[PDB]
């Protein structure tokens, strides 16, 4: 270092700290101003840099953000990776590094085309470039758009913007507001402060708009069974039997009382084709008392090619949902977690027969669009675990007659970490975006009911064997976001980009 903050070594360190500051914005800590402070740090530290230096600054900021926020992936790698301790740490640092590239990319491109510090760079160029940059991290090599700052404000002042343009609009606006604040602090000029406050305060009245209308007549008692069943060391018929006894014995008392019962992802730990007698018998018991069950299961279905394809599945039983193996009322998982449910670069099969022994097992993908689940005259658009954080995918599957949004997930991995909470926060956003109640049941994890505005209706603690029963009411409204999607944001992002690129090219 030489003089003040003008020298690079200090800025990389400061970028590391402000990146880490962004973690506090998300679900466990729930401090939304940490987003603006984090973004101001990223915006201000990239001022007056060479594109390469800014890209380095950006990379560090991402490393502080992703290293502190995503480090919970270690507990899954350590358990099932079969790897030494130091390698697992190496893999986690590698993941945070890979994610920080896009942050470094954002800063590198921002500095080259918009080097001078001007409101154009912070308020126009950055939010559009950030919109593109955050997209790449989310679209490249099967996703992982985790820790988007829009979710940090589910309870905050800007929540009214979400039902209109979606969560990615809050990402766009937060980058915008932070830029004006960072510009105001660096230039010692109050004019961007006024604009930033105005830009920040104007969306506040939008939280009082209700784009949905409720429906007392369709009010139902719903039950979500959270079995605390641990992850399996050894699979025998005894553990399977122990698992079904846990769920059925909790399900049987509520069959008469509650209209809909939900079981978490892969609740039945056996293939669907084996359990046909248990399933058909369970359907009868439910239909007689006038209730319906929604459960996750593993389905290996014979392909036309006569080989076997395995799907992560949701199936429907009970009244209004007669169970059939060929029944079209079911959900198969589309987007598969990269190293958990599938092996990337599966072409490595050639060395496999000699030398080592590698996993050949991989799941299969369902259709990108699947019809909503129908049970008890209720339409549920469903998503399994990770899928709920994909906002565009959820909205495309959402059909206006949909009564509830449904997520079943197994958070048993990551337990006691901040991951399940981060996961839970993003799920709330889908409810506010679409103005529908969300029913989320986990094996162990956050099992709760969320209202149309993102309000938490009812919740049960983690790591317990419990049933969450309460009354939930449907809503028939249509938000602007449900109709348009994020098309308006991209048009705005094009307009901002088109203008900012045209100004940079002179
Ligand atoms: C491998 C991932 C690279 C790890 C990124 C950390 C870079 C860093 O923070 O080094 C700055 C240092 O504090 C100097 O000021
Ligand atoms: C330079 C400006 C730095 C500002 C930092 C804001 C930090 C706010 C810290 C608020 C902490 C909230 C919290 O501690 O929640 C923790 C969790 O619930 C239990 O571990
Ligand atoms: C500055 C924050 C930089 C933090 C980046 C260091 C990564 C932390 C890490 O990988 O540790 C795994 C964690 O301990 C498993 O729970
Ligand atoms: C302000 C600088 C301090 C901000 C650092 C926050 C890091 C944090 O939130 O710690 C969570 C931890 O990574 C959970 O594994
Ligand atoms: C390179 C990454 C290789 C390690 C990834 C393997 C892994 O973590 O597996 C998780 C497990 O399958 C979760 O169910
Ligand atoms: C380029 C390389 C970038 C970093 C890749 C390194 C490690 C990623 C492996 C960690 C992710 C695998 C964990 C598996 C998992 O999380 O499974 C959970 C469950 O199956 C679904 O919800
Ligand atoms: C122009 C846009 C480029 C964006 C590059 C994309 C990601 C870079 C993120 C990784 C950080 C790159 C570090 C570069 C570096 O270390 O620079 C060496 C030094 O500046 C030489 O004199
Ligand atoms: C230049 C890249 C432009 C890519 C736009 C494609 C797109 O909008 O993808 C939708 C995405 O899933 C929504 O976040
Ligand atoms: C140049 C275009 C960049 C390629 C991304 C466009 C794209 O893949 O579209 C997103 C798709 O709709 C969602 O997966
Ligand atoms: C939070 C950061 C807000 C920074 C505002 C700094 C500012 O307004 O500068 C004073 C103004 O120039 C009066 O002379
Ligand atoms: C999604 C939400 C999209 C909202 C976009 C709405 C208005 C854009 C106005 C942006 C222009 C505001 C910058 C003006 C400014 O910063 O001026 C500072 C001062 O005058 C310098 O000396
Ligand atoms: C909506 C409210 C906008 C108020 C803007 C404002 O208060 O700016 C004053 C500034 O902080 C004084 O230097
Ligand atoms: C290569 C793309 C990076 C994929 C990393 C896998 C990952 O992020 O796992 C998260 C976990 O699966 C959440 O359920
Ligand atoms: C600064 C932030 C400014 C936010 C703009 C505020 C309101 C615009 C929304 C006006 C309503 C647009 C019509 C959409 C609509 O009415 O959706 C219902 C329809 O049934 C679906 O097909
Ligand atoms: C520069 C990229 C401009 C391409 C914009 C068109 C585009 O990629 O849109 C894809 C479409 O949304 C797919 O569903
Ligand atoms: C290298 C210079 C860096 C420039 C940095 C800023 C450039 C932003 C410009 C255009 C963004 C693409 C605009 C694409 C508009 C169409 C996207 C779209 O329509 O896709 C949405 C649809 O809903 C999908 O499902």
């Amino acid at each position: 270092f030489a003089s003040l903050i003008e020298r690079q070594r200090i800025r990389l360190l400061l970028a590391l700290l402000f990146g880490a500051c962004g973690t506090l914005a998300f679900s466990p800590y729930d401090v939304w101003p940490a987003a603006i402070i984090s973004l101001m740090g990223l915006q201000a530290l990239t001022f007056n840099r060479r594109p390469l230096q800014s890209a380095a600054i950006g990379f560090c900021w991402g490393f502080g953000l992703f290293g502190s926020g995503i480090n919970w992936v270690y507990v899954s790698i350590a358990t099932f990776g079969g790897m030494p301790g130091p390698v697992n740490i190496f893999l986690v640092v590698l993941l945070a590094a890979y994610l920080s590239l896009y942050t470094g990319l954002f800063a590198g491109v921002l500095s080259r085309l918009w080097p001078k510090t001007t409101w154009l760079r912070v308020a126009i160029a950055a939010p559009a470039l950030w919109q593109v940059t955050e997209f790449l991290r989310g679209w490249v090599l099967t996703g992982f758009p985790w820790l988007q700052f829009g979710y940090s404000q589910i309870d905050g002042p800007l929540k009214g913007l979400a039902p209109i343009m979606g969560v990615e609009a809050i990402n766009f606006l937060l980058m915008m507001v932070s830029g004006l604040l960072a510009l105001a602090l660096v230039k010692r000029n109050w004019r961007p402060l006024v604009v930033a406050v105005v830009l920040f305060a104007l969306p506040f009245p939008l939280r009082y708009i209700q784009w949905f209308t409720p429906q007392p007549e369709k009010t139902i008692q719903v039950s979500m069974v959270q079995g605390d069943i641990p992850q399996s060391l050894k699979w025998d018929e005894g553990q399977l039997l122990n698992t079904l006894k846990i769920y059925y014995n909790a399900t049987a008392p509520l069959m008469g009382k509650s209209s809909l019962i939900i079981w978490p992802e892969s609740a039945i730990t056996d293939l669907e084709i084996n359990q046909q007698p248990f399933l058909k018998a369970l359907d009868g018991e439910l239909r007689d008392k006038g209730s319906s069950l929604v459960t996750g299961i593993v389905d290996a279905r014979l392909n036309k090619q006569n080989r076997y394809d395995t799907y992560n599945t949701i199936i429907t039983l009970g009244k209004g949902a007669p169970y059939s193996y060929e029944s079209a009322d079911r959900y198969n998982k589309n987007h598969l977690v990269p190293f958990g449910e599938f092996v990337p670069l599966e072409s490595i099969l050639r060395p496999l027969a000699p030398f080592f022994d590698l996993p050949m097992s991989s799941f299969s993908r369902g259709p990108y669009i699947q019809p909503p689940l129908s049970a008890n005259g209720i339409e549920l658009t469903a998503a399994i675990a990770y899928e709920i954080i994909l906002g565009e995918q959820v909205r495309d599957n959402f059909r206006p007659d949909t009564d509830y949004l449904l997520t079943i997930s197994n958070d048993a991995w990551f337990g006691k970490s901040i991951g399940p909470w981060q996961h839970f926060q993003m799920a709330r956003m889908r409810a506010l975006e679409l103005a529908r109640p969300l029913l989320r049941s986990t094996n162990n994890g956050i099992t709760a009911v969320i209202g149309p505005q993102g309000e938490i209706q009812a919740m049960i603690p983690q790591f317990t064997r419990e049933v969450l029963t309460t009354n939930v009411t449907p809503t028939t409204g249509l938000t602007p976001y449900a109709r348009t999607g994020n098309w308006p944001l991209w048009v705005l992002t094009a307009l901002f980009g088109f203008a900012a690129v045209l100004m940079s090219l002179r």
Side-chain angles (χ1 to χ4, degrees), residues 17-18 20-24 29 64 67-69 71-72 418:
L17 282 172
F18 281 99
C21 193
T23 298
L24 296 180
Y29 313 105
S68 55
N71 55 13
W72 50 267
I418 62 183

Side-chain angles (χ1 to χ4, degrees), residues 165-229:
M165 296 188 252
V167 60
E168 298 190 310
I170 302 185
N171 302 326
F172 190 96
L173 182 60
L174 281 173
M175 177 58 78
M176 196 176 185
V177 165
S178 311
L180 295 173
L181 285 182
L183 178 77
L185 178 61
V186 173
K187 285 289 182 196
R188 303 165 289 175
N189 186 5
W190 47 269
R191 281 167 199 82
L193 176 46
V194 165
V195 181
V197 174
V198 168
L199 284 182
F200 186 84
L202 290 178
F204 183 86
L206 299 182
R207 65 190 264 117
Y208 295 157
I209 307 186
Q210 302 186 12
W211 292 104
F212 64 98
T213 169
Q215 298 172 333
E217 62 274 354
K218 286 198 213 176
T219 306
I220 55 156
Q221 195 204 167
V222 65
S223 307
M224 288 164 307
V225 178
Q226 164 179 316
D228 204 350
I229 298 174

